[PDB]
Amino acid sequence: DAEKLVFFAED
Amino acid sequence: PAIKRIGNHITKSPEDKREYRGLELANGIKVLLISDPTTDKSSAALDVHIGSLSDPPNIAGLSHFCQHMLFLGTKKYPKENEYSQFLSEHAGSSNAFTSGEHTNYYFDVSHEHLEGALDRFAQFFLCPLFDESCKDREVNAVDSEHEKNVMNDAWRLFQLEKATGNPKHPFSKFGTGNKYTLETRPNQEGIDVRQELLKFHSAYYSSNLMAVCVLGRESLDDLTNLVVKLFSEVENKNVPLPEFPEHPFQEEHLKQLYKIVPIKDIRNLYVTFPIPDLQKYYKSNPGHYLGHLIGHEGPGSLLSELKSKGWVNTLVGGQKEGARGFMFFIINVDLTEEGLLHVEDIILHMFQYIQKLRAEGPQEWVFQECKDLNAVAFRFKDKERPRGYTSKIAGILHYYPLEEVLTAEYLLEEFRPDLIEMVLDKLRPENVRVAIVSKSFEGKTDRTEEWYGTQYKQEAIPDEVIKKWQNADLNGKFKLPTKNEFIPTNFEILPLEKEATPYPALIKDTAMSKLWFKQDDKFFLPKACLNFEFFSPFAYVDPLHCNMAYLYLELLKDSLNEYAYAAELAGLSYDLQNTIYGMYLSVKGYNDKQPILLKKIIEKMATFEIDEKRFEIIKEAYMRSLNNFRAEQPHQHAMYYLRLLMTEVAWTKDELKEALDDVTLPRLKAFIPQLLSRLHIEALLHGNITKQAALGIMQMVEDTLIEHAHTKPLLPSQLVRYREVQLPDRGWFVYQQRNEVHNNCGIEIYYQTDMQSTSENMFLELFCQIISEPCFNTLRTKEQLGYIVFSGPRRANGIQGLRFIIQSEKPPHYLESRVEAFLITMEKSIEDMTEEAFQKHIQALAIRRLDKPKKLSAECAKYWGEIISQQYNFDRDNTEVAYLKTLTKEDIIKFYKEMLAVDAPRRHKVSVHVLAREMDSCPVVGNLSQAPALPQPEVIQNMTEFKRGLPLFPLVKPHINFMA
């Protein structure tokens, strides 16, 4: 089919 | 005055009742105000158009580190956890993320406390403290965050692509950061990180690079005054927006081949083409037009042929974001054993399809079909959850005019064949990059990526290969998609029936099936949810049958894929998977054509004819999938083991792959008829649909199975549910294992309470609400045990309890002592908290539990949960919250003293310790709060033995729901 983030906390 | 301009009409969907007002403050901040007088939770988000791409070359991860620090204190609110504590006490939540060009912060909270939350929030951008002590502690959280990504294949590839482009281009930067880049190296270089954090915040956190979105019950005028009062004070540094016109991939980076060794046993091919930034052409999205075609999975598609040749199973194609100034166009596929040997051929086929597009030229009807579909989707768009909505809007306010923010990424406008040809002209062999991921390259690589350690090799693709790809001609098997026949046309909302019910009603109750029905009475959108649970003891009777149930359904979806893709594009979706009790089927989306797809699915599962080739490929992929679980994170292994330990019957990954090698085609074929011969169906049909229509759908499912599968009813005594093991009073068991991939430990602590009930449920939930925030602030923020620190209730098989999950470099027994110390700290904390504070928590939980679903599928999921668990307590929330408000501080203390305290008479504790790769052994017991002395635990050496030596809880009794 049709078609990276760093967070403060893993939710 | 403090406002530079107020937006004209914000174009929204006609079905959208929320009110919008866009504005731009004098300081340059772009704002979108949203008034929703019905919302239970209000929310705000601020997106700063600066990210890791702007990290100083000598301090990788600075912007991400800045993001973490903004949560730990501001001049106006020094308390390092004032923000999180405030939100917790008012039913709120918060998070934030950092990308290459954005740092997005957001929160939600009880609609009554929007102002208090927003005030504390605005200080992040006015007077951050960046406290020295917090800095030295939080750097561990960042390091731990990177640590868990080190052995993650997706992250490894992500950084590898950056490391293989121009080294001078900021695209090459490591954005996560770690203890080395944020502390060790800086100290050695004589750099003061605290200063740098401040310098960075001061230089880039400028109002001209900020966008905010606020949603609350207040009127737009009141929200306008609130936002102005809190954000007009942000300073404008008139910072220029970072631009990256030169593409990270220059000539010397093209026509390159990369051979990479993965952690998991995966086989993938990644084809990449450098392309200009297409963001300004969003009105026509030429890149998405090509992604739609190249990534299409219908008959005649590139995927269809690659799958027919037995070379690949899945494919993703289309444009990929880069940053202002550059983008990429990709075509990624997984590989079969044979596909791995035919990479050159696969790519040739890729270019043959591309050549086919060039020959036919841009297709306007295709564009038009999507435009019209997007128009329908935007019009009947489900109402979003506030938090995610504000965060998303804050981000796109940077790319579109105020009036167009809601429609910009949904509606298509003009067909631009010239732009399409222009992008298509970039998809050529001379400008391709190829990467192959496979264990077969182990020991054959000569390079190492510094940040993740990724093993790989780089080679220039031979000119003769490039030349054969350039000569790609037309392949008769490649055709443009045909007109989508699943496009919905009937959107009428049937009038609410006179006997409509607020909750699902049992309208059919036979041995063959139990049907729950509810006509949507809140959302009024032309959509419906059809949920079916098919019960059969042969889906999980033993490892072999579990394997066959999975394989069967996987083969069915694979055969329906071409057909179903079109439906999916037309907003008609379905999920089909095996369960421990049988099969689960869910059809969602526009109600118009759901009957056609549903009938096709049932007809197919009952007349299914297995393709031997597909069977072997899927079996081989499933084998690796089971094996690949070894590469999952420690805390995941911990959760996995606890599940196996606490459930009556549960087949392990090892048992499944052992039994797999004996699943043969003949065996699978014999399995299906047996599986369908006897079943019981419990369904939930919820949406824009009538009682009589519901009965019609159910009958059609029954008739189809009976006709093709000769299905007969199952015996009620056969409808067995699994029980949870019942732990003994004052008992403590420890199961220990090791994770062979990650060099970090994991642990889950489970304090089993008792069977689920109104009183027990709220005792547990209130306690969790109370310790939630303090748990994170203590074990992570203060003690920095790890990035992952979690606490909360655990519900399974009608039983429940308190659980803690932690991933850390520290050994499990130490982790255990810390959780135990914290429990005592919470003890004193609760005894010392004021009735005032206590009542805040009760109210916080009350709001959390009463927050109502904003879309159909969310309401359905709640009802489904009651049906699946067989508790059928549809008015649960009102009941439990009413009871909750009755609870007193003393009740909680008693509950804790009888069930959770270390010397509690009814303490039921099980701990799962997962050791780090580099740990050969480890014991199970051993200015910080004092940890209490713990008993000697009984070590579990065999899961079967463990369960057998304990009794099993009974099953929860159903909440009788009278109906025909």
Describe this structure in words.
Chain A is mainly beta and 11 residues long. Chain A has one strand at 6-7. Chain B has 964 residues and is an alpha+beta fold. Chain B folds into four domains: 1-241, Metalloenzyme, LuxS/M16 peptidase-like (Cytochrome Bc1 Complex, Chain A, domain 1), CATH 3.30.830.10; 242-471, 2-Layer Sandwich (Cytochrome Bc1 Complex, Chain A, domain 1), CATH 3.30.830; 498-724, Metalloenzyme, LuxS/M16 peptidase-like (Cytochrome Bc1 Complex, Chain A, domain 1, 2-Layer Sandwich), CATH 3.30.830.10; 725-964, Cytochrome Bc1 Complex, Chain A, domain 1, CATH 3.30.830. In chain B, a hairpin with a 4-residue loop joins β2 and β3. In chain B, α1 crosses α7 and α2 (82-89) runs antiparallel to α24 (758-782). The N and C termini of chain B lie far apart (65 Å). The chains are: A mainly beta (11), B alpha+beta (964). Chain B: Homodimer. Can also form homotetramers. (Microbial infection) Interacts (via N-terminus) with varicella-zoster virus (VZV) envelope glycoprotein E (via N-terminus); the membrane-associated isoform may function as an entry receptor for this virus. Chain B: A motif (SlyX motif) lies at residues 809-814.
Output the keywords:
heterodimer, A: 11 residues, mainly beta, 18% strand, B: 964 residues, alpha+beta, Cytochrome Bc1 Complex, Chain A, domain 1, seven-stranded mixed beta sheet, 19% strand
Count of individual beta strands of chain B:
27
Give Rg of chain A in angstroms: 12 Å
- Going by helix content, strand content and strand pairing, the class of chain A is mainly beta
The number of E-state strands of chain A comes to 1
Overall 3D form of chain B: globular
Q: What fraction strand of chain A?
A: 15-25%
Judged by helices, strands and strand pairing, the structural class of chain B is alpha+beta
- N-C termini distance of chain B: 65 Å
Biggest β-sheet strands, sense, barrel of chain A:
none
Portion of residues in beta strands of chain B equals 15-25%
Specify the biggest β-sheet of chain B: 7 strands, mixed
Largest interface: A-B, 11 and 33 residues
Helical segment tally of chain B? Answer: 30
What fold name stands as the CATH topology of the largest domain in chain B?
Cytochrome Bc1 Complex, Chain A, domain 1
Q: Determine the fraction of residues in helical runs of chain B and give it as a percent range.
A: 25-40%
